[PDB]
């Protein structure tokens, strides 16, 4: 009778067809990812086409229910989720061109190789060729060749495609009543209707910028420390008061400084905690790893893995005759079907990955009770933070000792804690300015604050000011260095990595207080605390039904993003950094360029 | 003096769909209820309005076994005073019942690879069901004021949707075969005993 009542019954029919199709399609994807055959590729695609065609029809039907007429929020939000046409807001030929450009820059990224003209037959592709050089090469010139020739050959072909992509995405976002395509991306965090828990797309920028200024002291001390270590290694290439050359940061873009550990380790004589050998000595297999992860989640008052998870998952590389995608994934096909695809080896790294992916399955099971649409993490940052806090607790030597993998003969040397925390800082603290600056640039590019004749001029103004990294070769407007990174040329929001990084430390900080943990936050293991498991579950069972502000508040007692716990995790490293940088210049000067002497 | 054909009901090769649930009348026979209860096979065996131990020590004029297939989650709806798509639109037990609900997992018999679509359930109905009322009409659900005209569309929905029953489904989305024992006593000769 009322529009609200009719939309409730439409959603019923929708939840029952979507659950079905999504299952069949997911099963086709499982079959291809576990058994890579030409027949399986064909069946995977036909399912993808059906699912797309289904959602197209359903979007047109959802459109027919005026949102204004609904008072019920969980129904109004579910209807809204469906109503977004996305691409079809543009003309047939304009949408065809957008899909064309999107396809092309994806293809150029995944298939663009760089040849050494000396041998025209031999060329290096980014994966594995170029990526290997950027993560393993110590030769200054080799790294510079790989950094520059990737941007010059591939990063220059992407430049005119990106310009058209920006203008088309903006026109699409304008039609969806967003100001720019960046505002559209920020729409994920937006919450309206719920008084006290509302969140605006503009607030996100204020909150990322305020939290970032609090990271600036630790990051400055980290950057200065790294610059000192790098300066010793390449003496005649780095300035004690300048930026760090982009080609000397451990990876193709310096996204994360984890590979710099080799050259920045504080205590080189002290060994590392790698229970790999202990697992091999105790005859552990892929099954014992997943059974140990299950024990972890059951100890926190969480459900045991379903009987179907044990029979249907592929937790080992399938021998030698059938090929399989070996990326560790957590599948949730619907209808109670939960699987993990992981080509598991008896290593500590795989053992920790079992906890991360099994945490995703735990989140999946918790919100599986919700209606189909609302079966997702609270915001784009949420699901990845959940899996990560498990691998945090599992990696603690305290945990390892209790599970028998770490010998009780292991004495906690505070030098190993500094080696550990620096390796952590290199990944986590180091990626925050990179992630911030990249999105800041992207948001302003859509905003219309940076013209095309300034795109690269500003990209390197921002890399020097915000990140404290300098380009080793002068890049003009024929280059497109942002696009030479996966997410930029593959149309993916990057801010998720900033938000989720701050979330995971908030989550751990809250669950560790619930676990009545005493001492350094980096040594916390939340095992056997069913109170911490209840605290976490309260949010996990919510899914996307309630605002992320309220979801977060259900765990940490706060409606907003917070740096305080991340800084708290790294406070012992920070005092050490503050001591080691006593005789060094902390901070950078933007005028120094490696190429300009 | 022959035994009631309970195996004919419980061991049927194919069961009915819940919306068009099947009813069998058991008559002129000696019913052994301990054979049914003492088995451990069934995932559920609940008797209402009468104790199962005192069933052998009683005569009725007739017995009715109502059989059908539903998901694991919905098994809690085949009980008096319960609500949801099944209790509301498919099979309704009176709020005050006198009989037994016997249910067991039939993932081995009723869920094929690729999905078994032979089992349907009613998703929409314009009125709640009365106890033991059966509805088999495939009339289009007119959700809106707009006349449907026998065609599926906006505010026009096919009331019957299928259980895609697949062997890899979780227990709550898996097939469960349900048999409901009704006891009848009229001013007429008692055909069933113990
Ligand atoms: C907006 O919109 C929206 C949409 O529409 C809405 O919402 C909605 O609402 C509704 C209401 O009703 C709901 O419904 C509900 O639900 C629930 C849940 O379910 C679920 O889960 C399960 C598991 O757990 C399963 O099985 C199922 O199936 C389901 O699933 C899913 O879910 C989801 C979510 O929910 C969805 O979405 C989906 O869809 C689904 N699926 C499908 C396929 O469908 C339920 O539960 C309910 O039911 C009812 O009935 C029953 C009987 O049958 C009962 O039961 C009970 O329970 C409990 C628990 O809980 C128990 O206890 C326990 O148990 C255990 C075992 O189990 C043990 O034994 C222990 O010891 C114990 O303790 C008990 O016992 C039982 N009982 C018996 C005798 O058995 C329940 O409870 C219920 O009841 C009732 O109902 C009513 C209604 O009918 C109510 O009343 C009223 O109403 C009105 C209206 O009409 C108003 O509302 C008022 O206020 C009220 O009051 C009551 O309350 C109840 N109760 C209680 C306590 O609560 C149902 O069905 C839905 O669902 C929803 N949705 C969502 C999404 O959520 C909203 O609301 C809007 N908004 C606003 C603001 O409004
Ligand atoms: C990797 O990858 C690769 C590639 O892919 C693989 O290889 C291969 O694969 C394939 C697949 O792809 C396979 O198969 C083939 O194919 C065909 C087709 O089918 C399928 O597909 C399609 C699409 O294309 C679909 O569609 C459709 O659907 C529909 C529905 O919707 C249907 O309908 C139906 O029909 C029926 C009849 O037929 C009825 O009527 C019903 O009612 C309806 O509904 C249709 O039909 C379709 N279409 C078509 C055209 O067909 C579908 O669905 C599907 O999916 C097929 O057919 C064939 O098959 C054959 O063979 C087999 C052997 O192997 C046999 O048997 C089987 O066995 C197994 C064991 O081994 C079993 O299992 C089991 O079972 C149980 C029960 O019994 C349970 O379930 C468990 O769980 C499980 O495990 C099963 O079952 C069986 N089956 C059945 C069905 O049951 C079959 O049967 C067949 O044959 C037959 O046989 C018999 C005796 O036995 C005789 O009697 C008959 O006559 C015959 N028939 C014929 C037709 O022939 C084909 O073959 C293949 O097989 C494969 N290979 C091998 C060596 O195996 C691989 O495998 C992978 N790998 C891994 C490791 O993964
Ligand atoms: C959101 O983005 C999607 C992207 O695809 C767009 O989806 C398609 O939208 C077009 C219209 O712009 C749909 O085209 C046609 O829809 C018809 C349905 O309505 C008919 O009947 C009513 C009376 O009941 C008439 O008033 C009306 O004028 C129409 O005659 C169908 O006849 C067709 O859809 C059929 O698609 C396939 C075959 O191609 C069949 O399998 C289906 O059963 C179905 O009947 C026709 O194509 C089109 O259906 C939508 N796509 C899909 C795949 O369904 C959305 O339009 C866009 N949002 C908005 C608001 O336009
Ligand atoms: C619930 O999840 C837990 C996983 O934490 C599972 O329960 C465990 O089942 C194993 C079965 O082998 C039990 O193992 C036993 O270990 C002892 C030594 O500790 C050994 O002497 C025994 O012979 C046996 O191998 C284990 O104790 C048990 N743990 C608990 C606390 O229950 C199980 O998979 C899940 N159960 C259900 C009902 O789903
Ligand atoms: C979480 O709780 C479980 C269960 O209480 C803890 O498991 C216990 O772990 C200890 C070893 O860390 C086991 O102790 C052993 O006892 C035997 C005999 O008593 C002894 O011979 C061994 O030398 C050893 O001391 C204990 O059996 C085991 N209990 C169970 C039921 O598994 C677990 O350690 C806790 N983990 C954390 C991180 O809090
Ligand atoms: C047909 O019905 C009879 C009786 O209901 C079932 O008998 C069972 O037989 C197995 C051994 O095959 C025993 O373990 C059970 O205890 C028996 N149950 C009862 C209630 O007597 C028989 O299995 C059924 N047949 C099929 C194929 O389902
Ligand atoms: C940390 O490590 C150094 C190693 O030389 C040691 O002297 C010191 O006592 C340790 N503890 C603290 C809290 O500084
Ligand atoms: Cl770059
Ligand atoms: Zn993950």
For residues A279 and A346, the answer to whether their CB atoms sit within 8 Å is: yes
Classified as helix, coil or strand, A361 is helix
User: Residue A548 is inside which H or E element, if any?
Assistant: helix A548-556
Q: Which residue out of A148, A357, A380, A439 is catalytically annotated?
A: A357
What is the whole-number distance in angstroms between the Cα of residue A378 and the centre of ligand 9? 15
Hey, what are A501's tokens? Answer: 């990084």
Place of tokens 């890899």: B168
Same domain, A288 and A368: yes
C-beta of residue A227 within 8 angstroms of C-beta of residue A383:
no
Is residue A427 domain-shared with residue A511, that is, in the same domain?
A: yes
Separation CA A47–CA A550 (nearest Å): 36
* Distance in angstroms (rounded) separating the CA atoms of residues A76 and A65: 10
Nearest to A335 among B123, B145, B173 (CB): B173
Cis peptide bond N-terminal to A239, omega within 30: no
Chain A partners within 8 Å of B123 (Cβ) = 12-13, 16
Residue A285 within a domain? yes
Tell me whether residue A213 is exposed, middle or buried, using C-beta atoms within 10 angstroms of its C-beta: 0 to 12, 13 to 18, 19 or more: exposed
| Last residue before each gap in chain A (C to N over 2.5 A) | none
Classify residue A535: in a domain, yes or no.
Answer: yes
Alpha carbons A594 and A243: distance in angstroms, whole number: 9
- Cβ–Cβ contacts within 10 Å for residue B61, how many? 15
Of A6, A24, A308, the CB nearest to B155: A6
Q: At what angle do helices A414-447 and A571-580 cross, to 10 degrees?
A: 100
> Which of B93, B90, B66, B99 has the alpha carbon at shortest distance from B79?
B93
CA distance B83 to chain A (A): 16
- For A255, the domain range is 200-270+413-597
Q: Would you call A475 a catalytic residue per the annotation? A: no
Among A452, A506, A514, A463, smallest CA distance to A485 is for A463
CA distances from A279 to A41, A289, A313, A351, A377 (A): 37, 9, 22, 10, 33
Q: Cα angle at B104 between A308 and A297, to 5 degrees?
A: 30
B171 inside 8 A of chain A by CB: yes
What is the Cα–Cα distance from A222 to A578, expressed in whole angstroms?
9
**How far is the C-alpha of A130 from the C-alpha of A132, rounded, in Å?**
5
Q: Contact at 8 Å (CB) between A246 and A260?
A: no
Identify the CA nearest to A104 among candidates A167, A154, A45, A161. Answer: A161
Q: Which residues 30-69 in chain B show a CB within 8 A of chain A?
A: none
Place of tokens 């319960």: B82
CA distance A247 to A151: 11
* Domains of chain B (ranges, CATH numbers): 6-121+164-193 (3.30.70.1840)
Ligand 5 neighbour A402 (Cβ under 6 A): yes
Q: Which two tokens stand for residue B49?
A: 């309005």
A174 part of a folded domain: no
Q: Any bridge partners for residue B30, and if so which? A: B3, B193
Nearest to B172 by CA among A19, A299, A354, A540: A19
What residues have CB less than 8 Å from B152, skipping those under 6 apart? Answer: B140, B158
| CA-CA-CA-CA torsion sign (A432, A395, A136, A325) | negative
A262 and A293 both lie in a single domain: no
Task: Indicate if A425 and A562 belong to the same structural domain.
Answer: yes
Looking at the DSSP bridge assignments, the partners of residue B69 are B17, B177
Quick check: B166 and A338 CB within 8 A?
A: no
Asked whether A424 and A431 are in contact (CB, 8 A), the reply is no
Residues of chain A found within 8 Å of residue B172, distances taken between Cβ atoms? 336
CA distance A548 to A493: 18
CB atoms within 10 A of CB A494: 21
A262 and A282: one domain? no
Residue A396 lies in a domain: no
Report the nearest-CA residue for atom 14 of ligand 7. Answer: A414
Phi/psi-derived region of residue A303, left when phi > 0, alpha when psi is between -120 and 50, beta in every other case: beta
**Closest-CA distance of chain B to residue A299, Å:** 23
Task: Point out the ligand nearest to the CA of residue A4.
Answer: 1
Kind of pairing between the strands at B29-30 and B192-193: parallel
Distance CA A300, CA A296 (A): 7
Nearest to B55 by CA among B9, B4, B121: B4
Beta strand ranges found along A256-364 (DSSP E): 329-334, 337-341
Co-location of A355 and A419 in the same domain: no
- Say whether both A573 and A478 belong to one domain: yes
Q: Tell whether A142 is covered by a domain.
A: no
Rounded to an integer, what distance in angstroms lies between the CA atom of residue B151 and that of residue B6?
42
B84 touching A (Cβ < 8 Å): no
Q: B72, B166, B159, B73: which is closest to B118 by C-alpha?
A: B166
Q: Following DSSP, what letter does each residue of A209-256 receive, concatenated?
A: HHHHHHHHHHHHHHHHHHHHHHHHHSTTT--TTSPEEGGGSSSTT-S-
Q: Which two tokens stand for residue A79?
A: 């209807």
DSSP label of A68: G
Residues of B in contact with A13 (CB under 8 A): 123-124, 157, 161
CA A25, A27, A33, A36 torsion: positive or negative?
negative
Is the shortest distance between the CB of B143 and ligand 6 below 6 Å? no
Partner residue facing A6 (CB), from B144, B169, B174: B144
Q: Which of A84, A110, A142 is the last residue of a domain?
A: A84
Q: In the structure, which protein residues have their CB atom closer than 6 angstroms to any atom of ligand 3?
A: A 53, 56-57, 59-60, 63, 85, 88; B 153
The residue whose two tokens read 């003209």 is A117
If we measure between CA atoms, which residue out of B181, B177, B182 comes closest to residue B18?
B177
Percent composition of chain B: helix, strand, coil (DSSP 3-state, to 5): 15, 30, 55
Contacts of B105 (CB under 8 A, 6+ apart): B43, B72, B171, B174, B175, B176
How far is Cα B23 from Cα B40, in angstroms, rounded to an integer?
A: 24
What's the CA-to-centroid distance between B55 and ligand 6, angstroms? 21
CB atoms within 10 A of CB A597: 6
- Phi and psi angles of residue A464, each rounded to the nearest 5 degrees, phi first: -75, -40
Domain termination residue (choose one: A53, A84, A115): A84
Query: Is A355 within 8 Å of A399 (Cβ atoms)?
Result: no
* Cα atoms in the 13 Å half-sphere on the side-chain side of A487: 12
Q: How many domains does chain A have?
A: 3
Where a domain ends, among A19, A50, A84? A84
HEC sequence for A529-546: CHHHHHHHHHHHCCCCCC
Same domain (yes/no): A224, A245: yes
- Binding site membership of A for chloride: which residues? 151, 459, 463
Q: Six-digit token pair at A25?
A: 């399609």
Atom of ligand 6 nearest to the CA of B36: 20
Q: What distance in Å separates the CA atoms of residue A388 and residue B119, rounded to the nearest whole number?
A: 42
In this structure, are A352 and A438 located in the same domain?
no
Please name the residue that has the structure tokens 């005993």.
B193
Q: Is A61 on the interface with B (CB under 8 A)?
A: yes
Q: Please indicate whether, in this complex, the C-beta atoms of B143 and A6 are within 8 angstroms of each other.
A: yes
A534 with A548, same domain?
A: yes
Q: Which residues, 6+ apart, have CB-to-CB distance to A298 below 8 Å?
A: A304
> A115 — phi, psi (to 5°)?
-85, 150
Name the residue of B7, B34, B37 whose CB sits within 8 Å of the most ligand 6 atoms, as the mutation to test its pocket.
B7
Residue A194 tokens read as 């719920």
Residue nearest to atom 34 of ligand 1 (CA): A370
A19 is catalytic: no
Six-digit token pair at A561? Answer: 């993003």
Binding-site annotation, residues of A: 151, 255, 327-328, 356, 360, 384, 459, 463, 497
Angle between helices A496-514 and A548-556 (to 10 degrees): 30
Burial category of A580 from C-beta neighbours within 10 Å (exposed 0-12, middle 13-18, buried 19 and up): middle
With respect to residue A172, please indicate whether it lies within any of the assigned structural domains: no
Is any Cβ of chain B less than 8 angstroms from the Cβ of A363? Answer: no
CA distance A427 to A525: 21
Distances (CA, A) of A152 to A94, A147, A156, A475: 29, 9, 6, 9
Nearest CA in chain B to A7: B155
Same domain, A295 and A221: no
Instruction: Provide Rg for chain B, Cα atoms.
Output: 18
Based on the fold, state whether residues A484 and A574 are members of the same structural domain: yes
- Please tell me if the CB atom of residue A304 comes closer than 6 angstroms to any atom of ligand 4: yes
B120-122 and B160-162 strand pairing: antiparallel
Cβ–Cβ contact A69 with B under 8 A: no
A358, part of any domain: yes
Per-residue H/E/C for B20-31: CCEEEEECCEEC
In a domain, A255, yes or no: yes
Residue A594 buriedness (CB in 10 A; 0-12 / 13-18 / 19+): buried
Q: What is the interface size between A and B, counted as CB pairs within 8 Å? A: 52
The stretches of A314-454 forming alpha helices (DSSP H) are 348-367, 382-395, 397-402, 414-447
Residue B104 zone, left/alpha/beta (φ > 0; ψ -120 to 50; rest): beta
DSSP-derived secondary structure letter, A191: B
Q: Identify the bridge partners of residue B102 per DSSP, sorted by sequence position.
A: B45, B179
Cα(A73)–Cα(A193) distance, integer angstroms: 7
- Nearest-CA residue for atom 24 of ligand 6: B11
- Technique employed here was X-ray
Output the CA A29–ligand 3 centroid distance in Å.
27
Q: Give, to the nearest 10 degrees, the angle between helix A548-556 and helix A530-540.
A: 170
Interchain CB distance below 8 Å, A336 and B173:
yes
Degrees to nearest 5, angle at CA A593 with A589 and A595: 170
**Where on the phi/psi map is residue A332: left (φ > 0), alpha (ψ -120 to 50), or beta?**
beta
Residue A261: both structure tokens together: 């550990």
Residue B180 burial (C-beta neighbours within 10 Å; 0-12, 13-18, 19+) = buried
Is A295 near ligand 4, meaning CB less than 6 Å away? yes
Q: How far apart are CA A139 and CA B151, in angstroms?
A: 71
Which of A399, A404, A378, A358 lies closest to A515 in space, CA to CA? A399
| Assigned token pair, A518 | 């005493």
């Amino acid at each position: 009778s009322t529009i609200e009542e009719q939309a409730k019954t439409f959603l019923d029919k929708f939840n029952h067809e979507a659950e079905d199709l999504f299952y069949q399609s997911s099963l086709a994807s499982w079959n291809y990812n576990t058994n890579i055959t030409e027949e399986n590729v064909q069946n995977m695609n036909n399912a993808g086409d059906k699912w797309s065609a289904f959602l197209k029809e359903q979007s047109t039907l959802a459109q027919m229910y005026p949102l204004q007429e609904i008072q019920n929020l969980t129904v109004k939000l579910q209807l809204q989720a469906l109503q977004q046409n996305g691409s079809s807001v543009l003309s047939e030929d304009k949408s065809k061109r957008l899909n064309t450009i999107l396809n092309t820059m994806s293809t150029i990224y995944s298939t663009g190789k760089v040849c050494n003209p000396d041998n025209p037959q031999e060329c290096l592709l980014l994966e594995p060729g170029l990526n290997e050089i950027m993560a393993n090469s110590l030769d200054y010139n080799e790294r510079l060749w790989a950094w520059e020739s990737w941007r010059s050959e591939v990063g220059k072909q992407l430049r005119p495609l990106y310009e058209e992509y920006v203008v088309l995405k903006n026109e699409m976002a304008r039609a969806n009543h967003y100001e720019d395509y960046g505002d559209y991306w920020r729409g994920d965090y937006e919450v309206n209707g719920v008084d006290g828990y509302d969140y605006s797309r503009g607030q996100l920028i204020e909150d990322v910028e305020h939290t970032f200024e609090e990271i600036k002291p630790l990051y400055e001390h980290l950057h200065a420390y790294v610059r000192a270590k790098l300066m010793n290694a390449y003496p005649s290439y780095i300035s004690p008061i300048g930026c760090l050359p982009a080609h000397l940061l451990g990876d193709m873009w310096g996204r994360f400084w984890t590979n710099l550990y080799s050259l920045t380790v504080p205590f080189g004589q002290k060994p590392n905690i790698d229970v790999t050998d202990a697992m091999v000595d105790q005859a552990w297999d892929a099954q014992r790893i997943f059974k140990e992860a299950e024990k972890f989640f059951v100890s926190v008052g969480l459900p045991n893995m379903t009987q179907g998870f044990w029979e249907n998952s592929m937790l080992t590389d399938p021998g030698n005759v059938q090929k399989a995608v070996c990326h560790p994934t957590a599948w949730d096909l619907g209808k109670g079907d939960f699987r993990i695809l992981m080509c598991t080896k008896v290593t500590m790294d795989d053992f920790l990955t079992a906890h991360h992916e099994m945490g995703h399955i735990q989140y999946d099971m918790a919100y599986a009770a919700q209606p189909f649409l609302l079966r997702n993490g609270a915001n784009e940052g949420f699901h990845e933070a959940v899996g990560e806090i498990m691998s945090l607790s599992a990696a603690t030597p305290k945990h390892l000792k209790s599970i028998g993998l770490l010998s009780p003969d292991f004495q906690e040397d505070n030098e190993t804690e500094i080696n550990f925390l620096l390796k952590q800082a290199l990944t986590i603290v180091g990626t925050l300015p990179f992630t911030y600056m990249l999105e800041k640039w992207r948001w302003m590019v859509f905003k219309g604050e940076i013209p095309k004749d300034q795109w690269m001029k500003k990209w390197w103004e921002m890399k020097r000011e915000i990140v404290g990294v300098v380009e080793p070769v002068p890049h003009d407007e024929t280059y497109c260095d942002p696009a030479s990174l996966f997410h930029v040329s593959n149309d993916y929001s990057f801010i998720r990595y900033y938000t989720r990084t701050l979330y995971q430390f908030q989550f751990q900080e809250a669950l560790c207080q619930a676990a009545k943990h005493e001492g350094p936050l980096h040594k916390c293991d939340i095992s056997n605390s069913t109170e911490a498991g209840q605290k976490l579950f309260n949010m996990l069972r919510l899914g996307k039904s309630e605002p992320w502000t309220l979801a977060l508040e259900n765990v940490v007692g706060a409606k907003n993003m917070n740096v305080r716990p991340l800084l708290n995790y790294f406070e012992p490293l920070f005092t050490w950094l503050k001591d080691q940088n006593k005789n060094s210049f902390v901070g950078w000067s933007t005028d120094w360029s490696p190429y300009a002497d | 003096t022959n035994l009631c054909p309970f195996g004919e009901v419980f061991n049927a090769t194919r069961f009915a769909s819940v919306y068009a649930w099947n009813r069998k009348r058991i008559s002129n026979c000696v019913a052994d209820y301990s054979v049914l209860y003492n088995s451990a096979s069934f995932s559920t065996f609940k008797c209402y309005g009468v104790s199962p131990t005192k069933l052998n020590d009683l005569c009725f004029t007739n017995v009715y076994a109502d059989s059908f297939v539903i998901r694991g989650d919905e098994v809690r709806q085949i009980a008096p005073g319960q609500t949801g798509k099944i209790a509301d639109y498919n099979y309704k037990l009176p709020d005050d019942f006198t009989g037994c609900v016997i249910a067991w997992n039939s993932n081995d018999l009723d869920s094929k690879v690729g999905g078994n679509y032979n089992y349907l359930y009613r998703l929409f109905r314009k009125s709640n069901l009365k106890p033991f009322e059966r509805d088999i009409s495939t009339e289009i659900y007119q959700a809106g004021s707009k006349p449907c005209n026998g065609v599926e569309g906006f505010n026009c929905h096919f009331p019957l949707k299928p259980y895609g029953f697949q062997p890899t489904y979780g227990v709550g989305y898996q097939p469960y075969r349900v048999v409901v024992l009704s006891f009848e006593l009229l001013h007429a000769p008692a055909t069933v005993c113990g």
